[PDB]
Design a protein around this ligand. Structure first.
Ligand SMILES: [Zn+2]
Length: 196
């Protein structure tokens, strides 16, 4: 009832998500399944997420990411890191050690513990598409495995990407499921046959 919305809205700017066409080889650290709308990635590795827009949001626009549990009986529970990982210092001195989602390669990164919902989120300033690219790419890191006991503990999660203005007004929203694991390529292949 107080759970964050995961409803898709492209909004004024035609906000869409995009992902690299990376394939499923062993060496891949991040691979996306268009069939599943699901990202398979490695712990603490680079996870490119693309922002596609029909119109450019003004400077000052922010991009927020938040994880929630997929299943209804776990949706009220705040997605956080497991004790083991929250106890180690893989902490970059910006991210709170409890946050599952980080952004790498951005010194303007901002982290939030919601005063009321206790939910974690990470936000970065929106920048217009790179040279030689028609989208804007953000590098996320997931700091726990899906399997991590005492954390997600094999419970499936979604990442909600929100576009908001400098004043916090919602502009658009999208989402994708993510599975954090040692063999992203292997698992994508497996889950894509599981449809059949
Ligand atoms: Zn963990």
């Amino acid at each position: 009832s107080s759970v964050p919305s995961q409803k898709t809205y492209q909004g004024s700017y035609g906000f869409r998500l995009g992902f690299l066409h990376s394939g499923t080889a062993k060496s891949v650290t991040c691979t996306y399944s268009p069939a599943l709308n699901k990202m398979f990635c490695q712990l603490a590795k680079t996870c490119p997420v693309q922002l596609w827009v029909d119109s450019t949001p003004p400077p000052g626009t922010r991009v927020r990411a938040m994880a929630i549990y997929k299943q209804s009986q776990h949706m009220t529970e705040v997605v956080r890191r497991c004790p083991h990982h929250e106890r180690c210092s893989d902490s970059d001195g910006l991210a709170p050690p409890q946050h599952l989602i980080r952004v790498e390669g951005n010194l303007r990164v901002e982290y939030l513990d919601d005063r009321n919902t206790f939910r974690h989120s990470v936000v970065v300033p929106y920048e217009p598409p790179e040279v030689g690219s028609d989208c804007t790419t953000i590098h996320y890191n997931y700091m726990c495995n899906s399997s991590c006991m005492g954390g997600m503990n094999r419970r499936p999660i979604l990442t909600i990407i929100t576009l908001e203005d400098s004043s916090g007004n919602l502009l658009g929203r999208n989402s994708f499921e993510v599975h954090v694991c040692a063999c992203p390529g292997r698992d994508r292949r497996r889950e894509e046959e599981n449809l059949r």
